Amino acid sequence: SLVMSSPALPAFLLCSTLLVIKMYVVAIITGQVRLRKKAFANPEDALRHGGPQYCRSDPDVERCLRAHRNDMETIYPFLFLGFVYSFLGPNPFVAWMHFLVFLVGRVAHTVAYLGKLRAPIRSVTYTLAQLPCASMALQILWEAARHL
Amino acid sequence: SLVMSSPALPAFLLCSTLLVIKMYVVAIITGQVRLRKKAFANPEDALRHGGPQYCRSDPDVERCLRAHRNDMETIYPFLFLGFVYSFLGPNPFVAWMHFLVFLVGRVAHTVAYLGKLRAPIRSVTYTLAQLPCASMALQILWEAARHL
Amino acid sequence: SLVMSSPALPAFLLCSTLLVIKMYVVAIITGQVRLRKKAFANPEDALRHGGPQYCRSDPDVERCLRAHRNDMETIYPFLFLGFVYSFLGPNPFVAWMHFLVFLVGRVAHTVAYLGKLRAPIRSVTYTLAQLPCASMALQILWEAARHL
Numbered sequence: 001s002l003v004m005s006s007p008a009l010p011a012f013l014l015c016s017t018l019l020v021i022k023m024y025v026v027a028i029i030t031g032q033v034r035l036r037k038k039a040f041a042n043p044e045d046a047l048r049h050g051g052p053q054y055c056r057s058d059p060d061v062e063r064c065l066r067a068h069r070n071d072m073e074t075i076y077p078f079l080f081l082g083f084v085y086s087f088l089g090p091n092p093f094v095a096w097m098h099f100l101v102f103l104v105g106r107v108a109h110t111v112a113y114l115g116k117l118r119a120p121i122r123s124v125t126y127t128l129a130q131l132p133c134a135s136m137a138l139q140i141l142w143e144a145a146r147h148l
Numbered sequence: 149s150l151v152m153s154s155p156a157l158p159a160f161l162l163c164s165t166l167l168v169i170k171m172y173v174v175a176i177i178t179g180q181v182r183l184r185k186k187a188f189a190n191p192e193d194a195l196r197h198g199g200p201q202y203c204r205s206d207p208d209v210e211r212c213l214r215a216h217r218n219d220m221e222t223i224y225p226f227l228f229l230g231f232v233y234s235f236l237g238p239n240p241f242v243a244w245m246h247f248l249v250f251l252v253g254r255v256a257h258t259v260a261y262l263g264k265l266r267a268p269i270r271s272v273t274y275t276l277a278q279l280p281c282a283s284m285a286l287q288i289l290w291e292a293a294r295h296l
Numbered sequence: 297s298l299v300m301s302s303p304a305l306p307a308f309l310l311c312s313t314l315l316v317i318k319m320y321v322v323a324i325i326t327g328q329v330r331l332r333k334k335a336f337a338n339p340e341d342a343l344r345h346g347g348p349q350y351c352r353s354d355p356d357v358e359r360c361l362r363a364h365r366n367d368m369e370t371i372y373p374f375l376f377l378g379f380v381y382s383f384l385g386p387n388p389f390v391a392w393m394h395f396l397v398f399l400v401g402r403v404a405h406t407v408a409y410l411g412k413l414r415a416p417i418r419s420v421t422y423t424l425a426q427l428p429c430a431s432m433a434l435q436i437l438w439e440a441a442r443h444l
């Protein structure tokens with residue numbers, strides 16, 4: 001299997017795929033909140049689900065969208081950085097720690113966001129998860145620059 | 149050519165690249181709607197295109213942005229999942245079906261969204277396209293986990 | 297090192313990683329603008345940073361989010377297209393030009409956006425940067441299609 005192309009790759013692929021699934025969970029939750037709060041973005045949706053008055057914004061729907069947007073701002077860069085980093089021959093344990101900190105930090109971020117936990121819990125989880133991303137980015141920079 | 153690194157890879161790369169182009173089409177349409185409806189997001193844009201009163205929201209512009217956002221929520225994960233999945237040695241025909249269902253579902257989604265088609269047409273196309281994504285995600289999970 | 301898998305790959309990885317860092321800069325700027333303008337998206341944030349009246353929109357915060365969103369609309373596709381393109385055996389210099397035009401155009405885009413530069417400066421930088429993306433997309437299309 002090509003999953004064993006580098007020692008760090010299986011761990012990366014596991015964490016990444018779980019994070020993609022975690023984004024899908026946010027999408028599904030968003031839909032549930034739209035239905036339960038009767039807050040649809042489109043008149044065609046509203047007309048099917050009770051009437052035109054239900055084409056409206058809702059604070060919980062907006063919160064769901066913010067969490068999903070923040071995921072796109074952070075998880076997508078990780079999918080790139082972590083993949084490249086997996087092939088730079090990092091220490092297996094060190095690589096695992098990078099991926100695990102990102103995974104745990106991001107899951108915690110969604111819990112803190114959707115759960116409306118007191119500040120600065122969400123902001124701390126965000127910061128924590130970005131640390132391994134910064135680390136991988138710098139490592140890629142050095143490796144790429146030195147091969148020019 | 150490195151396109152033949154796995155039997156499924158050419159089909160993946162074709163479908164993916166078409167989907168990226170399809171997102172670019174949404175970006176271009178968005179610009180056209182801004183110009184034709186005179187609805188700009190920035191005062192500097194509005195001042196060039198008729199005056200400060202044209203820095204305003206518009207329902208069709210907002211709809212375009214929703215379609216584009218939904219694309220980012222779904223197509224970007226597919227770019228990751230489909231790439232990895234291509235290297236897991238799936239059945240060539242089965243892989244093609246995964247990619248084709250996503251491609252057709254997503255093109256249909258944009259048509260249903262921008263075309264303001266009756267519900268639940270858009271929601272059904274969304275659901276259809278997510279099915280192969282869920283399938284690939286699970287397959288990657290098993291392969292990654294078993295190589296830990 | 298696997299960075300030398302293709303002659304164009306180091307240049308791609310350098311430009312890409314710089315662009316990811318450039319997105320991170322936008323995220324950090326956004327946070328700074330929220331703090332300095334006292335404009336928070338969440339009541340829990342506002343209550344920590346002065347009171348509930350600070351859960352409010354702000355034009356500069358919205359501008360930051362637009363720049364970040366536009367980055368997600370363009371840089372993420374480049375991460376995909378440029379990676380694949382690096383393995384299609386393009387002319388080293390031609391590939392560098394594709395990556396450099398995207399890098400320079402996108403950095404200029406953020407400067408023009410956050411700097412509120414007169415139109416059509418931002419729109420021109422956007423257009424310029426999309427040109428190598430269109431070029432790479434077409435090249436991938438031909439290579440993928442011919443290997444079907």
Ligand SMILES: Cc1cccc2ccc(N3CCC(C(=O)N[C@H]4CCC[C@H]4CCc4ccccc4C(=O)O)CC3)nc12
Nearest residue numbers: 024027028031032034035045268271272274275278279282
């Ligand atoms: C993210 C994801 C991953 C994997 C599989 C997924 C499978 C589905 C999936 N959805 C994400 C939330 C969506 C959701 O709950 N939308 C609701 C809010 C506005 C409209 C309403 C749709 C109702 C509906 C849906 C489908 C068919 C008919 C109807 C109807 O109107 O009868 C549904 C699709 N995500 C998935």
Ligand SMILES: Cc1cccc2ccc(N3CCC(C(=O)N[C@H]4CCC[C@H]4CCc4ccccc4C(=O)O)CC3)nc12
Nearest residue numbers: 172175176179180182183193416419420422423426427430
């Ligand atoms: C997505 C994509 C892929 C490949 C190539 C692309 C090439 C271009 C491209 N655009 C996406 C829609 C944008 C658009 O229509 N914007 C208009 C709405 C607000 C401002 C206005 C801009 C007008 C303008 C543009 C360029 C130069 C001068 C002016 C002017 O003001 O004279 C233009 C760039 N996307 C592309």
Ligand SMILES: Cc1cccc2ccc(N3CCC(C(=O)N[C@H]4CCC[C@H]4CCc4ccccc4C(=O)O)CC3)nc12
Nearest residue numbers: 120123124126127130131134320323324327328330331341
């Ligand atoms: C993008 C990125 C890359 C690499 C490393 C990064 C490291 C951090 C990082 N931030 C992106 C801007 C965020 C920011 O400035 N947020 C402020 C606006 C609303 C709330 C406020 C948070 C204040 C805060 C933050 C952390 C801990 C405690 C508190 C507090 O309340 O005491 C902070 C996290 N991005 C990074």
Ligand SMILES: CCCCCCCCO[C@@H]1O[C@H](CO)[C@@H](O)[C@H](O)[C@H]1O
Nearest residue numbers: 022025026107110111112114115116
């Ligand atoms: C990956 C998806 C994670 C979903 C985490 C949802 C956390 C829900 O948490 C809930 O939040 C409510 C406020 O929204 C509170 O009223 C409840 O006390 C709390 O249980």
Ligand SMILES: CCCCCCCCO[C@@H]1O[C@H](CO)[C@@H](O)[C@H](O)[C@H]1O
Nearest residue numbers: 170173174255258259260262263264
């Ligand atoms: C990939 C890009 C797909 C673009 C699909 C655009 C579909 C346009 O479809 C149009 O939508 C209008 C409402 O918006 C209707 O008034 C028209 O009847 C319909 O033809």
Ligand SMILES: CCCCCCCCO[C@@H]1O[C@H](CO)[C@@H](O)[C@H](O)[C@H]1O
Nearest residue numbers: 318321322403406407408410411412
């Ligand atoms: C990658 C991040 C690039 C940040 C570029 C920020 C450009 C700031 O530029 C500033 O913009 C202000 C308006 O916003 C103007 O008042 C100032 O004259 C100008 O210096």
Ligand SMILES: N[C@@H](CCC(=O)N[C@@H](CS)C(=O)NCC(=O)O)C(=O)O
Nearest residue numbers: 066067070122123126323326327337
């Ligand atoms: N787009 C972000 C940029 C900065 C950021 O990511 N901040 C973190 C920590 S405060 C966050 O959780 N932001 C909430 C959000 O993006 O909605 C924002 O508007 O806040």
Ligand SMILES: N[C@@H](CCC(=O)N[C@@H](CS)C(=O)NCC(=O)O)C(=O)O
Nearest residue numbers: 027030031041214215218270271274
């Ligand atoms: N961000 C989405 C999450 C759920 C989703 O993707 N729903 C599908 C099927 S209803 C959709 O087409 N949503 C419209 C949109 O994202 O604007 C939303 O707000 O609806």
Ligand SMILES: N[C@@H](CCC(=O)N[C@@H](CS)C(=O)NCC(=O)O)C(=O)O
Nearest residue numbers: 175178179189362363366418419422
């Ligand atoms: N989502 C974009 C689609 C078109 C686009 O990307 N336009 C360029 C050139 S005008 C841009 O800089 N848009 C500003 C933005 O996306 O906020 C929009 O709403 O304008």
Ligand SMILES: CCCCCCO[C@@H]1O[C@H](CO)[C@@H](O)[C@H](O)[C@H]1O
Nearest residue numbers: 130131132133134135136138139142
């Ligand atoms: C936001 C600040 C986080 C910094 C992450 C540290 O990242 C570290 O940078 C070093 C020097 O470039 C590298 O040698 C090291 O491999 C890397 O883990």
Ligand SMILES: CCCCCCO[C@@H]1O[C@H](CO)[C@@H](O)[C@H](O)[C@H]1O
Nearest residue numbers: 278279280281282283284286287290
């Ligand atoms: C949203 C529900 C869609 C489920 C997609 C099914 O996905 C399937 O899962 C099986 C069991 O894990 C795998 O053996 C199989 O390869 C995969 O195609």
Ligand SMILES: CCCCCCO[C@@H]1O[C@H](CO)[C@@H](O)[C@H](O)[C@H]1O
Nearest residue numbers: 426427428429430431432434435438
């Ligand atoms: C938006 C218009 C930009 C077009 C980019 C041109 O792209 C070019 O297309 C040719 C024909 O397909 C290819 O032979 C060539 O390799 C490619 O650079």
